[PDB]
Amino acid sequence: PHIGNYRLLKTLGKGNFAKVKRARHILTGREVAIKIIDKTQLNPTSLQKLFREVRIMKILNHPNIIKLFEVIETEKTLYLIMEYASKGEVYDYLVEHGRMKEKEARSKFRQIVSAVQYCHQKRIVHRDLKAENLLLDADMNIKIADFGFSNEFTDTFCGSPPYAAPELFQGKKYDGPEVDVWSLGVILYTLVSGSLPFDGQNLKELRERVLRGKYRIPFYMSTDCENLLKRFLVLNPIKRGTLEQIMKDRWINAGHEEDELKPFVEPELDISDQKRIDIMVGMGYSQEEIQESLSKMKYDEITATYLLLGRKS
Ligand SMILES: C[C@H](c1ccccc1)n1c(=O)c(N2CCNCC2)nc2cnc(-c3cnc4cccnn34)cc21
Numbered sequence: 313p314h315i316g317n318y319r320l321l322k323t324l325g326k327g328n329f330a331k332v333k334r335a336r337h338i339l340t341g342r343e344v345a346i347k348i349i350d351k352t353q354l355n356p357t358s359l360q361k362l363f364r365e366v367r368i369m370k371i372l373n374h375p376n377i378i379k380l381f382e383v384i385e386t387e388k389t390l391y392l393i394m395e396y397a398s399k400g401e402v403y404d405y406l407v408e409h410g411r412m413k414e415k416e417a418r419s420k421f422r423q424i425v426s427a428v429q430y431c432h433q434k435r436i437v438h439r440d441l442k443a444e445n446l447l448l449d450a451d452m453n454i455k456i457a458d459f460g461f462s463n464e465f466t467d468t469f470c471g472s473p474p475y476a477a478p479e480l481f482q483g484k485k486y487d488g489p490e491v492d493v494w495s496l497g498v499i500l501y502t503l504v505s506g507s508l509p510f511d512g513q514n515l516k517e518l519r520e521r522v523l524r525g526k527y528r529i530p531f532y533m534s535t536d537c538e539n540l541l542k543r544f545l546v547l548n549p550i551k552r553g554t555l556e557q558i559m560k561d562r563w564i565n566a567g568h569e570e571d572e573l574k575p576f577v578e579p580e581l582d583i584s585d586q587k588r589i590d591i592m593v594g595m596g597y598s599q600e601e602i603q604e605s606l607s608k609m610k611y612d613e614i615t616a617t618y619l620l621l622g623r624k625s
Pocket of ligand 1: 324325326331332345378394395396397398400401404444445446447457458
């Protein structure tokens with residue numbers, strides 16, 4: 313079971329027309345995650361959605377967002393070779409361990425807010441932020457995943473209802489980032505409490521609770537955490553805080569002297585490490601080939617080998 317330079321191993325999950333498998337890169341030995349998409353079952357609008365997702369992944373380069381390494385395409389199948397996060401979904405972690413202490417939620421939430429604010433810098437809204445789409449790497453760092461429902465902000469999608477902003481329930485047109493801000497308030501509440509702030513026995517009950525916007529504050533929750541939730545979970549999207557403003561909040565930065573959370577500054581990608589390039593020449597690729605794939609940033613077998621050589625094993 314090979315595809316390109318990858319040996320396919322255990323399945324991580326499976327869904328509508330796709331599965332994700334862990335894999336090993338043969339040339340470097342690094343582990344990756346590969347999404348395998350059966351294109352034959354997709355209609356032309358699903359196909360267009362797929363290629364948009366790929367385009368979004370190429371735009372985004374952040375240490376708390378799953379990175380794209382390579383695209384392999386046949387006429388029947390699309391393979392997205394991605395960063396692997398070995399400790400699974402935040403959702404499953406909360407189920408096993410219960411709520412995080414605020415100091416543990418804070419470390420994760422700073423990473424989440426940095427990643428999503430950076431998406432908004434790039435004019436991308438995720439639109440399906442939920443505990444299930446936050447992965448954890450071997451060091452318990454957050455990696456946001458699955459931009460299959462994401463879009464640019466300049467359709468009639470509504471994500472997981474418990475995380476959906478009230479304007480989505482009323483069927484209202486919406487700009488973009490404000491709905492991610494609301495979902496991040498729901499995420500903060502789930503990290504600190506282990507439960508959702510709005511729930512119901514059915515969609516009607518859940519919808520009514522979201523629109524009322526009331527949620528329970530546990531006795532153990534600090535005043536500063538409660539006040540921060542108020543900046544996310546604002547019914548009026550016009551008055552909802554922006555993430556750049558929320559980054560200055562007291563709770564976000566408690567115990568982070570000299571390290572106030574700030575918008576991420578994307579570094580210039582080094583495509584010129586000759587030690588890595590020397591290794592790839594020894595593997596068989598020519599110097600000129602490596603230069604052309606890296607400069608056009610082709611997400612092909614070469615640029616993926618270069619990136620993976622830049623990561624641990
Ligand atoms: C495929 C799916 C998935 C894909 C995208 C976003 C979230 C979840 N998935 C599950 O469904 C799941 N299940 C849920 C049902 N109960 C058993 C555990 N566990 C997972 C654990 N690790 C990953 C993972 C790790 N490195 C990466 C890099 C890219 C993508 N995925 N990925 C994905 C998982």
